[PDB]
């Protein structure tokens, strides 16, 4: 499975990005670190497109697709 790792999030961003990714897809194993958000990713959107929208709040390299 591809895991999306959103590294480096802000105060209230955890809650909010949690809230935003929550608009595009569904996050599980929501590790709400003080500043991070990892969650496993479904694969429901072309890597090339998830990239594109998170990209409304965050950037291409903050995004890693690992297994």
């Amino acid at each position: 499975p591809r895991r999306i790792i959103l590294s480096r999030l802000k105060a209230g961003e955890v809650d909010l990005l949690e809230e935003e990714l929550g608009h595009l897809t569904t996050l599980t194993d929501v590790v709400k670190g003080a500043d991070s958000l990892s969650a496993i990713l479904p694969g429901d959107i072309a890597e090339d497109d998830i990239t594109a929208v998170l990209c409304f709040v965050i950037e291409a390299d903050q995004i890693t697709f690992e297994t």
Binding site: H23, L24, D49, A52, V53, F56, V57, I58
Partner: protein, 128 residues
Amino acid sequence: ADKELKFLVVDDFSTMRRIVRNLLKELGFNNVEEAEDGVDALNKLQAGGYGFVISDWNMPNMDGLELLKTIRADGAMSALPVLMVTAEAKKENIIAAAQAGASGYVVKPFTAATLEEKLNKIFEKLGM
């Protein structure tokens, strides 16, 4: 966070334009212009001065995205922030907005308090 940022409230509907206006008000924003469409806006934009397109997704002659792609294949307007105002938070809109190059999105009607938060993040990402 310029309480004077020039909002091209592109929408073809007056009262909304008016509460958007009044909420911008109770929140402190008072500089709002109104446009009725994409050719009008493109014509209007072919002019310039616009900083924030609070563009409603839909309008006649040329809509929000053609507005946005033409905006993008054209040398001069290729990078304007377009806050697509959407009546609802939907993915493809959100993505097409993304692949053709849009800046962000918001859902009406919002309280003064909510409009307050969305503006903040675009501002954030674009570096404003």
